Each structure stands twice: as structure tokens, then as C-alpha cells.
Swiss-Prot record, chains A, B:
Induction: Transcription is increased specifically in response to 2,4,6-trinitrotoluene (TNT) and its indicator compounds 1,3-DNB, 2,4-DNT, and 2,6-DNT. This is Aspartate aminotransferase. GO terms for cellular component: cytoplasm; cytosol. Disulfide bonds: none annotated. It comes from Escherichia coli (strain K12). The keyword Nucleus does not apply. L-aspartate binds at residues 34, 130, 183, 374.
């Protein structure tokens, strides 16, 4: 049965990680990571999360299965973060949330739900986007098309090109937007651009799908959701795949949500029943520990305040490294304008380095980024900044 | 997009649970549950699990993502439980295990893997089987066919009918077997029947898929794996979807495994790379907490000994209720032979009650089972046994 199977394409990212491990050079620096690291180069468990886990250890009296859609408190806290307290979507009971195994799990549940219950055939994603978006949608039998996004000259959002690209999208296609902290570019629409996009998507009949894995990392929790909320104000229907992996540092516990929105309570409940059927046929019901930690924190004033401050500290450290990177590049004689780095949001930015500059940085200097030139600024520290920038200057 | 969607069929099981909650009668008894309960009617967190969770709380310093296939120690412990220490499959590196979100998650990963990488079109499952098997395989675009299994007269395995039914299976079809504690019947092949089935399946070219969610609940850890091991001795290839939900009481933490076996190390590694691609496109990587608890227990002599004893205590309480059920039915004047209950394995048995007897038990007596007449003997206690049996006698 298995003798003819072709090996999966080797994953460029994990191949890089292996090379990094083996590399025996002392001054080595990994900017290819896809998670937060702190100033000591660690990805710690948050304090608020440890306090919540101690409380669960003391108070849980069963591990009996959750419902298919997971912990109710978790779903309510999620909708409030997405749409805001007092949102009409919430008051009008127009949204239903399934807790899922990560944002990736939420994207797959959305994809299976759409493939099996609607006429959707195609999802539009930005060029560039996260490479796993394609695998997930394709696995559900959906085609993925790309729309233009990045102006490589001013290192900004090429808005006219985006709009002109999406002209090719037909009514009933899905269009995927990153809620904030676009991955890999760190370039997000302004609120006015989000509003223009919300109106255009309504007029063209696009189903918006928001991928919202970095809420809190661009400007703050409420601000980072303004784009989504501009869409929700204008559309009867949308889907949000959100993640708590990064903003709670809960990556391996698989804590995300798929939120379905429809015109009214009757319609969303009927459609959500098929989303629950899609989950039942996949992993049945979601993992409790990470989501229970989130609900425990979000629903307790003291814990939520500690966590909100931890998230602010990560966001601020990221901004500090963006600034220190640009200053140090200037000081080490780069000459080029890297000021676009200060404006970009979240952990990631296209450095503007070519795939060959990236390869050279790795081979000659032991500095690792991914071939697209994406760097994770949270991999930078005050200690490794000078060597990192010296190397980058050497390959420019 | 969502206005025309048809509601999913209401799930008969969850509808029963709701009715049970609402029911305000005092003497009510739920035998429709699908999880273990102890003598107080609770589904507690195991002591070994609490001790392991305290150790994780004290020692974990990151929640950084696991690999796609999860914790390596977990995979090794899993293969040893499945195949036995010293197994040639392990020595010859013929098996690869992905930690998955439950046994259900492992079945879906197996199904996606087979749909996308082999010619498999069809999976054979027993009549009766677990209803979610069909949803999972169908979601991956595989047909499900049923083979005969239950002799309703002697309440045993109808072996001739099973063999004759499977004659219709073609070479390259998958045949699913429950490793022990068949759900819903509690009827398992004897070792000699397992051996006959292993030989027949090799001769006919069937790919065996074992669903092994109750290891330890029929006779013990090693004994309950003898059927699987008889197959593994005879086949170059098989798949096992196993679960720790019940034997560790870790239901909601989603802890299972998909184990792929091929003729040799090169072939299994090549095929496993596509199983990992199937996982990456689904939920990316598995939830750490439940699996880390399992690996922590299985790899520590003191914890493993406590857990093994807890599992033995559950298995023994289940046997005690099977015996007490038969005795009490006799004492309350049932008259019919219910001795088949003593021989059946695990939490579940077909009571032999009809769908209308089940409905009557619920409406008139507040005793809940599922329409097939399946009862969970772990829902029985010394305290509720007399009333339960009085009611059953009343509807015979």
C-alpha cells in the first residue's frame, strides 16, 4: 500500500532550524524563528499563564469532554475581544465561536465548513502570505489565488495594485485578510484603507475570512481589531480564525477559535451546526488546558490585568528592537534607508535582503533568516544587535 | 453565503444528555454516558495525572511549539504499549507515531493520509460500530461499508458471518478492527480468532486499521494488545489510531496517537512524511499538556506504577458492576439469561433491550441508555443497581 508513496516536499523552514542547531559557531543568531523571544532569547511561559495553571491544578475535578465548540466562557471572551463589548453582533446573537486547536485548526475547520456547505471554490490570499494558508485550504479542496500587496520600493502597502488584483475575484469567493501584524511583511491597512476594503468587499460579494493571530502586537487589543470591526459593521457574514498562541505565549497548547457570523441568530445557529459537524468529523472536541487558561485569565480582573501588561511589554520590546535595529544599521554604515522597519507592525518584517544575501548571511556569518528575507525582530537583543548589523552591512 | 445551509442532523446522543439534565426526577440514572465514572458517579482526574501536572507546572519553562508529530518520548512510550518492549517492529524502526488530538484526531489524520497518498477508497467497519467512524472517513471522501459481527442470540461474535461479509472487501480496502473492548458490544475476538483474521487479511490484501481506545480495560495492558500484535506479526503495513482519553482519564486534553507501520525504515519514513504533511494542513502540531502528562507518567517508574494501579482499579470496578448487574437482575425476577454481560469486555454492552424498551425506561423510569440498547456499566453503582434493575425488569 505504501511502497510507491512520494516523500512530502522537505519544509524549508524546519530545514533551517536543523541547520541552526547543528551550527557550532558561537556568535550564531536565529532570526528565522516564528515565535516571540524575550531579551534573554527565551520563549517563557507567561506569569499570568503560570498563575492560571496553578489555579486549574487546584480546582479541576474532571477532564470530561468539552462540548464540540469548547468552553462557553472562552467563546464569549473571544467574541468580546474580536468585536468589542456592546457590539451589536454580540447583542443580536449573530456570532458563534468554536474553540479550536490553534488558529491553524480554526482555518481548517473554516475551510472544511465552506467546502462542504457552500459554493465556495476559491480563497484569495496576499502575495506574500503565510505558506501554510495554501496547504490548509487546498487540503479541503479549495483553490488559492494571490492578490498583490507589497510595494517593495517604499516598503509599504501597494493599495492600487491590491484593488486591481482583487478585481479578478468573483462574487462568492473568499478573501483572506490578516487582522493586524501581516505575516511576513508587518504592513497593515490603515483604518481608512480597511474601511474602503470593507465597502468594496460588500459590493463585490466577497466572503471575508480574517486570520487574527497577533491581536495586541501592533498597537493594542482594541486598536488591532478596528479593521475587523470595520468589516463586521458592513457585512452580514464573515469568518474569523483567531489564535492565542502568540498573545498568551500558549503555542503548543493549541488555543484558537473559529468565529462564524451571519445575518441573524437563526441563520448563524443553523450554519454553525454544520461547522460543529465538521469539527466532530475531525478531532471531535478541542483541548481544554490552553483554552481553560485563557478563559480563566480573561474572566478574572487581577489575572487579566497582569496578562495585558505582559502583552504590552512584548509589544514594547518589539518596538524597541525595531528602533535599535534601524539605529545600529545606520551606525554600522548600511547607508540605505531602513526607516520602514520602525513603521511595520508585529514580530516580522521583510528586510529587503535577497535569497542569496540570506544564504550568505547564514553560510559566512551564522545569521539565519528565511529565504524571503523575513526576519523576526523579537530574535534581536541589545547584545546581539551589533554583530547582527555588522554582518548585514557586510552582505549589502 | 449561509442563508440556504441545511442544519446538521441533531445528534441523538447529545439530545439524550440534554434531556437527562432537564429531567427533574430524583431517582434518575444515566447509562448513556461514554466515559468512565467511579463509585460516586464522578469522572475524576487520576491521581497520577494530578502528580504529573504538578511536576509540569513546576518544571515547564516554555510553551514553544512541539514538532508536527509531537513529543518524541510520547511516541516511544506509545509504540512500546502497542507492540511490546523488544518488538521487532520497534527494533527494525518500522513504525512512526504522530501524537494527535485524541484517537478521533488520529483516525482523521489516518483517513486524510490514505485518501491523499494511496488508492484507498473504502473502509470496512463492524455492524454495529461507533457512529463517528463513518463521519470521519466520509469527511475524507472515503466510503464506509459494514461487515457482520454480532450474534444477537448467544450475544457473541458471529465469526462465520464476519468472514463471509468481508469476502466482499477487495484488495487494498481498509478494514477497521477495535483492538479490545469493542464499542458498543464489549465482544472481542479470541486470540485464535485474531490470528485467523490476521492470516485472512494478509491473503486478501486488506490494510488493517486498529482503533485502540480502551487498552487496559478488557484484561490488562499487554493482554489487550495481543490481537494487534498478532496482526503486526503477519503484516508489512498497518495503522493504529490509539487513545489515552479513557485509560488516563484525559478525555478533554485530546491525547491520542496515529502509528504508521511499513515494511522497512525507509518506506515508513517516506510515507510518514506525507502523514506529517496531512497534520500540518489540519491543526499544524498537537496539544502538549495531555501528551506531556502521559509521557511524564509512562517514563517514571513511581508514577507509572500508581497509574497502572488506577487503571486496574477501574477495570476491576467495571467487572464488579457487570457481576452485580447480572446477580441483581436475577434477584429482581428478570428470568432471562444475562450471563453474557459477565464475559463482555470494557465499559459497554448491548443490553438486548429494544429501542422502544429504551424509550420506555427513559420516559417511565428516568433510566437513560442509547437507542441501540447500549449501556455503560460504569454508570452503575451499588447504590443505583436495585432501582435500575427493577425498572429493567418492568419493561422486559
Amino acid at each position: 500500500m505504501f511502497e510507491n508513496i512520494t516523500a512530502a516536499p522537505a519544509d524549508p523552514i524546519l530545514g533551517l532550524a536543523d541547520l541552526f542547531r547543528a551550527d557550532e559557531r558561537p556568535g550564531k543568531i536565529n532570526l528565522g524563528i516564528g515565535v516571540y523571544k524575550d531579551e534573554t532569547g527565551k520563549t517563557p511561559v507567561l506569569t499570568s499563564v503560570k498563575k492560571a495553571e496553578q489555579y486549574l491544578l487546584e480546582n479541576e475535578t474532571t477532564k470530561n469532554y468539552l462540548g464540540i465548540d469548547g468552553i462557553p466562557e472562552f467563546g464569549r471572551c473571544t467574541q468580546e475581544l474580536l468585536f468589542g463589548k456592546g457590539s451589536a453582533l454580540i447583542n443580536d446573537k449573530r456570532a458563534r465561536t468554536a474553540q479550536t486547536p490553534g488558529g491553524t485548526g480554526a482555518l481548517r475547520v473554516a475551510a472544511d465548513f465552506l467546502a462542504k456547505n457552500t459554493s465556495v471554490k476559491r480563497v484569495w490570499v496576499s502575495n506574500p502570505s503565510w505558506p501554510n494558508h495554501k496547504s490548509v485550504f487546498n487540503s479541503a479542496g479549495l483553490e488559492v489565488r494571490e492578490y498583490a500587496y507589497y510595494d517593495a520600493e517604499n516598503h509599504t502597502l501597494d493599495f492600487d495594485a491590491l484593488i486591481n488584483s482583487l478585481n479578478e475575484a468573483q462574487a462568492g469567493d473568499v478573501v483572506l485578510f490578516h487582522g493586524c501584524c501581516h505575516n511576513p511583511t508587518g504592513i497593515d491597512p490603515t483604518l481608512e484603507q480597511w474601511q474602503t476594503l470593507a465597502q468594496l468587499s460588500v459590493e463585490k460579494g466577497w466572503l471575508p475570512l480574517f486570520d487574527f493571530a497577533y491581536q495586541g502586537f501592533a498597537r493594542g487589543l482594541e486598536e488591532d481589531a478596528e479593521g475587523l470591526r470595520a468589516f463586521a459593521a458592513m457585512h452580514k457574514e464573515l469568518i474569523v480564525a483567531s489564535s492565542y498562541s502568540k498573545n498568551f505565549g500558549l503555542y503548543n497548547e493549541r488555543v484558537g477559535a473559529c468565529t462564524l457570523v451571519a445575518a441573524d441568530s437563526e441563520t448563524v445557529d443553523r450554519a454553525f451546526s454544520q461547522m460543529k459537524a465538521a469539527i466532530r468529523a475531525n478531532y471531535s472536541n478541542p483541548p481544554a488546558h490552553g483554552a481553560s487558561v485563557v478563559a480563566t485569565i480573561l474572566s478574572n480582573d487581577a489575572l487579566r490585568a497582569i496578562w495585558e501588561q505582559e502583552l504590552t511589554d512584548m509589544r514594547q520590546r518589539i518596538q524597541r528592537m525595531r528602533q535599535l535595529f534601524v539605529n545600529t544599521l545606520q551606525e554600522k554604515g548600511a547607508n540605505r534607508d531602513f526607516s520602514f522597519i520602525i513603521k511595520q507592525n508585529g514580530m516580522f518584517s521583510f528586510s529587503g535582503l535577497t535569497k542569496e544575501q540570506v544564504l550568505r548571511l547564514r553560510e559566512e556569518f551564522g545569521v539565519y533568516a528565511v529565504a524571503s528575507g523575513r526576519v523576526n525582530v523579537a530574535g534581536m537583543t541589545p547584545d546581539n544587535m551589533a554583530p547582527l548589523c555588522e554582518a548585514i552591512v557586510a552582505v549589502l
